[model samples]
Target: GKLEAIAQKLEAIAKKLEAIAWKLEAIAQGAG
Candidate 1:
């Protein structure tokens, strides 16, 4: 039970990180 909870939290963080990366990529493209 505890392990599954940790996995869920990690997945959420990974998704948020992807969103941040995408936004950064767009800004880099525009700046370049």
Candidate 2:
């Protein structure tokens, strides 16, 4: 149960990070 909970938190973090990465990429593309 603990490991599963941690995994879920990590998954959420990964998703947020991915979203930030995509946003930054789009900004970079626009700047170029």
Candidate 3:
């Protein structure tokens, strides 16, 4: 149970990181 919970949290963080990366890319394009 603990492992599954940690995995779920990591997955959520990964998704958020991906979204942040996408936003950063867009911002970079706009700045350019």
Candidate 4:
């Protein structure tokens, strides 16, 4: 969990798309 930090970098790069709205909106819809 702690070392899984590489993608944290992309989370910053795609902070406009994946990190911004996709995770916040789409994830919940698919989760349940």
Candidate 1, after superposition: displacement of residue 7 in Å? 0.2
Candidate 4 segments exceeding 4 Å error: 1-3, 16-32
Off by over 4 Å in 2: none
Cα lDDT of model 2 by residue, 1-32, tens digit: 59999999999999999999999999889966
**lDDT (C-alpha) at residue 30 in model 4:** 91
Instruction: Between candidates 2 and 3, name the one with more favorable TM-score.
Output: 3
lDDT value, candidate 4, whole model: 0.73
Clashes of each: 0, 0, 0, 0
Clashing pairs in 1: none
Candidate with best TM-score: 3
Residue-level lDDT of model 4, residues 1-32, one tens digit each, is: 75569788777778767566777787678957
Q: Which is better, 1 or 4, measured by TM-score?
A: 1
Alpha-carbon lDDT, every model: 0.95, 0.95, 0.95, 0.73
Deviation (Å) of 9 in candidate 4: 0.1
- The TM-score of predicted model 3 comes to 0.81
How close to the true structure is residue 8 of candidate 2, measured as C-alpha lDDT?
A: 95
Model 1 Cα lDDT, one tens digit per residue, 1-32: 59999999999999999999999999889966
Q: What would the TM-score be for candidate 1 when compared with the true structure?
A: 0.78
Candidate 3 minimal-lDDT segment of 10 residues: 23-32
**Model 2 CA lDDT for position 7:** 97
Model 2 worst lDDT run, 10 consecutive residues: 23-32
